[PDB]
Design a protein around this ligand. Structure first.
Ligand code: FMN
Ligand code: FMN
Ligand code: CL
Ligand code: CL
Lengths: 339, 339
């Protein structure tokens, strides 16, 4: 038996009662007990029952359109007892509870949960996934894994920061991060960090083609954006270069009780970064290693760009990543445009 | 009138908890402070309301109390119209001793969300924790151009250490290095912003020039003590660092999309500090910084000019940062030891 807890965000009061009625019916049939609280636009649900049976329900609740931003906070895998043996699904509306002695607990709960939701927006997606799976991020051991590492950043970003107002730079950076995160995630990748204007992400060794396609789609969407906007919009000057590496990296949660983070340790991270920087002096906006190339099964036109020093290593690209522009001219054009 | 909420962990008894309750009633009666103290599973929740001078005066007293630790103020309300608890000088509730069944769901939800909250706090940038502690929602703060000293430190010959050490040995070594850097940076008023691979990124204000140099020297010194504290079979015996400091304008604030948010620092100084840390590999000093950092220093260091490096930039260090070893020889030692 196992018991899990999740919180969610509500997307009218009668419909909630309908939910509760359905749950009472469905859960008694499956020996599932639990509770549904709601307060100030948030849902709280505890569910317990047979391991297989709770999972089917949770999948239904996940795809349910009535709530969004679902996060499973805790899972307990071999519970000796149930917490609510008699409740198929007790609905408790903490909004219309006016009892004074419950008001401090209720107020603290709302404050702490809202604060928790704010913090969730800064978490690495890999930690959120771990928590959703019932794994303690603080105790899980890091592992060596084979990964494709993705690095991209904004062309001539120092020139742009030098010549643009604060809000313009932030709007531009936010648009860039938005387009990178959306495309990376669409292809199954995971964004690791933003470092300045750099986007760091990782794909699995089975996602070589997806990484190439992510890189091409980001470049392609930037080119569209550049001719979507007027020439007074800074977005008209947004270009990117992309580096990809493949290797062994130690993935996990690192640090101390004072400060934690999710990190990838290994040479491939630095190689991807150097390759991304190398695209400035290349006729292509995407550079990757032989290891990345070997993870690809599609019929790309790989182009060998010789050995370069980051030891020297072979550097490849695909034909479709070729620049329709000259890079040095572009940075000068950016400089002159901002005069 | 001011109302604030905070949570804390108990350091290190029912009669002692009730003694806290009685002292608070007396003092709060004196200063027209009302509120609620709540205890649950080694955790403290307290709500305090009153006029500004008195609640701050009490809060400073509460921070220094040795009975609780890891104090975080979650919300602050200013010039409030009403009191939330007009009639309670200090109502102490021990939810551990509450056996009521109807309260058990809310009590369980509070414990779970608070414990998850404390875990999430560890992953936050120190600037976000700071903003929350000031009763400011970090998500509503607008980015600002500010003058910052940027700090970068990483592990020497880390590529060799990852290649030749087991995963668990690498993790113990990186955790200890992160543990040491975070403690010292934080002790000196610096803010750790994130870990990138084996690198620690932090920022200091322009008024903390000496504190940043002292932070760097202290980390180096503590690594030196540790290297001779341990046996030669311990990976910690081979742990060295290089440190880079830069000074310049950076944009600070929340950036990204609905898919991924983060606290980022945008600016030329971020890249410069990273390159200077890497530059220490080929210098007889473990610390390298720009001229702007040197101008932020009021203490009488022996600054040493290491010329210009790559537009070129001028590099400085302090005589105190000199290595008692040759760096190439130390790298060869690291590889020869691991055979
Ligand atoms: C917040 C929330 C909690 C829910 N909890 C339960 C639950 O505990 N048990 C249950 O059977 N259904 C629950 N539901 C939704 C129903 O599973 C779903 O609407 C219905 O069962 C679909 O019926 P079907 O299986 O015939 O498609 C919940 C929905 C929401 C939005
Ligand atoms: C969790 C916790 C909550 C506390 N709350 C209050 C409080 O609300 N009011 C108060 O005067 N002291 C509170 N105290 C303790 C104060 O520091 C107290 O005034 C101190 O222990 C004794 O003060 P005194 O030396 O001036 O007599 C609290 C302590 C703890 C650990
Ligand atoms: Cl693929
Ligand atoms: Cl990382």
């Amino acid at each position: 038996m196992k018991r899990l807890v999740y919180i969610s965000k509500i997307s009218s009061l009668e419909e909630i009662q309908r939910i509760g009625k359905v749950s009472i019916k469905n859960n008694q049939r499956d020996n599932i007990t639990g509770v549904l609280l709601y307060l100030q636009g948030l849902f709280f649900q505890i569910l317990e029952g047979e391991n297989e049976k709770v999972d089917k329900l949770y999948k239904k609740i996940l795809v349910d359109d009535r709530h969004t931003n679902i996060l499973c906070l805790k899972t307990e895998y071999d519970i000796t007892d149930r917490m609510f043996p008699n409740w198929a699904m007790k609905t408790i509306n903490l909004n219309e509870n006016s009892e004074l002695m419950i008001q401090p607990i209720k107020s603290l709960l709302q404050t702490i949960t809202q604060s928790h939701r704010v913090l969730e927006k800064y978490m690495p997606a890999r930690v959120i996934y771990l928590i959703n799976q019932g794994i303690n991020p603080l105790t899980v051991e890091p592992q060596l894994v084979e990964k494709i590492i993705f690095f991209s950043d904004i062309l001539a970003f120092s020139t742009l920061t030098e010549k643009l107002p604060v809000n313009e730079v932030v709007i531009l950076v936010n648009r860039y991060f938005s387009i990178c995160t959306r495309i990376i995630s669409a292809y199954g990748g995971e964004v690791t960090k933003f470092i300045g204007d750099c986007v760091m992400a990782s794909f699995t060794k089975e996602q070589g083609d997806a990484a190439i396609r992510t890189s091409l789609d980001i470049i392609s969407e930037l080119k569209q954006l550049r001719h979507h906007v007027e020439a007074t919009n800074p977005l008209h000057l947004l270009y990117t270069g992309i580096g990809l590496s493949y290797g062994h990296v130690i993935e996990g949660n690192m640090g101390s009780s004072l400060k934690m983070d999710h990190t990838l340790l290994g040479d491939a991270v630095n190689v991807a970064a150097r390759l991304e920087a190398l695209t400035r002096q290349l006729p292509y906006a995407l550079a990757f290693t032989a290891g990345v190339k070997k993870c690809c099964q599609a019929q790309w036109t790989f182009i060998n760009l010789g050995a370069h020093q980051v030891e020297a290593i072979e550097v490849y690209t695909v034909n479709e990543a070729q620049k329709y522009y000259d890079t040095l001219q572009i940075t000068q054009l950016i400089r002159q445009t901002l005069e």
